[PDB]
Design a protein around this ligand. Structure first.
Ligand code: HEM
Ligand SMILES: C[As](C)(=O)[O-]
Ligand SMILES: C[As](C)(=O)[O-]
Ligand SMILES: [Ca+2]
Ligand SMILES: [Ca+2]
Ligand SMILES: [Fe+3]
Ligand SMILES: [Fe+3]
Ligand SMILES: [Zn+2]
Ligand SMILES: [Zn+2]
Ligand SMILES: [Zn+2]
Ligand SMILES: [Zn+2]
Ligand SMILES: [Zn+2]
Ligand SMILES: [Zn+2]
Length: 319
């Protein structure tokens, strides 16, 4: 199918997305950059979608965090989310797609801006949200691995899938964990969808990059990087640590698993056969610049190995 400006897509219904794409690349993502708003928009897909529990309710990836922002953005686990929800609201008001559709679309478009990144499958047609998420559905960085895996499993995700999803922290910062240093990234290449995150979370902690007593925070190996206590445990806990380590310098696996599991999350509370596949509207991501490596001054003796069965992979380091 050919749309009114000459761009082509497999399903004609997908044509309405092209102007939205143009609008968000320029005005949400600063000219199709992999920056702050991509990071925030990706976080948003998860905070929207994970509001889904057979026992307590929530319609999953349904736009509820926008439609019902007054309730949802005041949940403690949604700290700092109101800023991206306010940025996105006017695009949803202006255009003719549902909030739920817009959140997943914006997420997928954003990630496609990041070198190393993937084109997350995208379906159009979600209806407007009909309920707010309950509170206590979003994992918090001071939660146990047991608690996190139980929460995620309740939403339909296995332990390994939680690891695959946390590839997102390769392009992510925190603002509210340590509010004296807002925007401090979880790995050293927040602009690059790579395995640096999995390497640096495995390094021995050295310092607190800001203040020293924040809930949900662990020592970082690097100034200007922040480590969540949750990432610290997941990297090291026997349930997840071998999966964790397997992502390292395994870019094809990161890409393949993140895209698959992101498509699964984006579809939570939704029916794929009721939606139209518009995946081909998402841009082609650039290729990885870099192989992932140890930061300068580090060696392999800096790695806390936690996988019993497999020795951490050899790695290059800067001089
Ligand atoms: C598995 C349990 C998870 C925990 C405990 C967790 C925790 C956190 C925390 C505490 C922040 C920082 C918020 C702030 O203070 O500004 C954050 C940021 C972020 N989260 Fe995770 N998260 C988890 C899973 C996920 C998932 C599955 C995704 C997938 C989309 C996601 C994507 C992101 C992104 C992209 C950011 C960066 C936001 C920004 O730079 O503004 N998180 N996460
Ligand atoms: C039960 As909870 C996801 O608020 O630790
Ligand atoms: C704030 As809680 C006890 O649900 O992790
Ligand atoms: Ca939701
Ligand atoms: Ca990165
Ligand atoms: Fe509102
Ligand atoms: Fe380097
Ligand atoms: Zn910006
Ligand atoms: Zn921001
Ligand atoms: Zn429009
Ligand atoms: Zn809670
Ligand atoms: Zn909790
Ligand atoms: Zn455990």
């Amino acid at each position: 199918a050919t749309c009114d400006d000459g761009r082509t897509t497999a399903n004609a219904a997908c044509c309405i997305l092209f102007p939205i794409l143009d609008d968000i690349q320029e005005n949400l993502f600063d000219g199709a950059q992999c920056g702050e708003e991509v990071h925030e928009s990706l976080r948003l897909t998860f905070h929207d979608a994970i509001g889904f529990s057979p026992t307590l309710g929530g319609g999953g990836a349904d736009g509820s965090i926008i439609a019902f922002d007054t309730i949802e953005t005041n949940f403690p686990a949604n700290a700092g989310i109101d800023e991206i929800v306010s940025a996105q609201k006017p695009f949803v008001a202006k255009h003719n797609i549902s909030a739920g559709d817009f959140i997943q679309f914006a997420g997928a478009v954003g990630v496609s801006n990041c070198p190393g990144g993937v084109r997350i499958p995208f379906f159009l047609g979600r209806p407007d949200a009909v309920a707010a998420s309950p509170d206590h559905l979003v994992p918090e960085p001071f939660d146990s691995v047991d608690s996190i895996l139980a929460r995620m499993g309740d939403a339909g995700f296995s332990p390994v899938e939680v690891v695959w999803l946390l590839a997102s922290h390769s392009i992510a910062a925190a603002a509210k964990v340590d509010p004296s240093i807002p925007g401090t990234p979880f790995d050293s290449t927040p602009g690059v969808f790579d395995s640096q995150f999995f390497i640096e979370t495995q390094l021995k902690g050295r310092l607190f990059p800001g203040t020293a007593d924040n809930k949900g925070e662990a020592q970082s190996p690097l100034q200007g990087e922040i480590r969540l206590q949750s990432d610290h445990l997941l990297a090291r806990d026997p349930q997840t640590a071998c999966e964790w380590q397997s992502m390292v310098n395994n870019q094809p696996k990161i890409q393949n698993r993140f895209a698959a599991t992101m498509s699964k999350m984006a579809l939570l509370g939704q029916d794929k056969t009721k939606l139209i596949d518009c995946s081909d509207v998402i841009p082609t991501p650039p290729a990885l610049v870099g192989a992932a490596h140890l930061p300068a001054g580090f060696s392999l003796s800096d790695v806390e190995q936690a996988c019993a069965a497999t020795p951490f992979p050899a790695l290059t380091a800067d001089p």
